[PDB]
Amino acid sequence: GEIAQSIKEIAKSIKEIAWSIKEIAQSIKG
Amino acid sequence: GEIAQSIKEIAKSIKEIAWSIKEIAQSIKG
Amino acid sequence: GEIAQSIKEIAKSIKEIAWSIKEIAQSIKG
Amino acid sequence: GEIAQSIKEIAKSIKEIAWSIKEIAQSIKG
Amino acid sequence: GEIAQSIKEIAKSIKEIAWSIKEIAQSIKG
Amino acid sequence: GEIAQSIKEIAKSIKEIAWSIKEIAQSIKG
Fold first, then answer.
1. Phi, psi of D29, rounded to the nearest 5 degrees
2. How crowded is residue D23: how many other Cβ atoms within 10 Å of its Cβ?
3. Which residues of A fall within a CB distance of 8 Å from F15?
4. What is the C-alpha separation between D8 and D5, in angstroms, rounded?
């Protein structure tokens, strides 16, 4: 089923998203 | 074990995302 | 592990995100 | 107990997010 | 509790979001 | 059974979202 693996990957992806969105916010809130 | 850790990290990343998106909305809504 | 707590917090953050994104959409769809 | 409730609320918030983001895309894609 | 159902719906919503965001990215990265 | 499948699909969609948002940030941050 790979549930532990899926969840681990989700955490990795969400961490990446949190950074990309930080960069967007930094230019948009300026 | 990874599951509890991944979920906690997910919780942290998503809270960071909530704050970045709030900054974007604050500028985009004005 | 705090899994029940992590998940509770995730729900709180995602709820906040749903509102911020609603405000963005309201100005962007106009 | 919170877990089933948090997840249901998460499901609801994310569905709301899907609709807001669809509104943004509809304007941003045109 | 509807946990299996909530999670199934989350997957459906997130799939929709992945597409809307693809359309946004396509116009914004251009 | 759906839970393992939904979560895997969620993992895939979120990875796609991480890549789309990275493309947006790359343009919005420049």
1. -85, -30
2. 19
3. 9, 13
4. 5
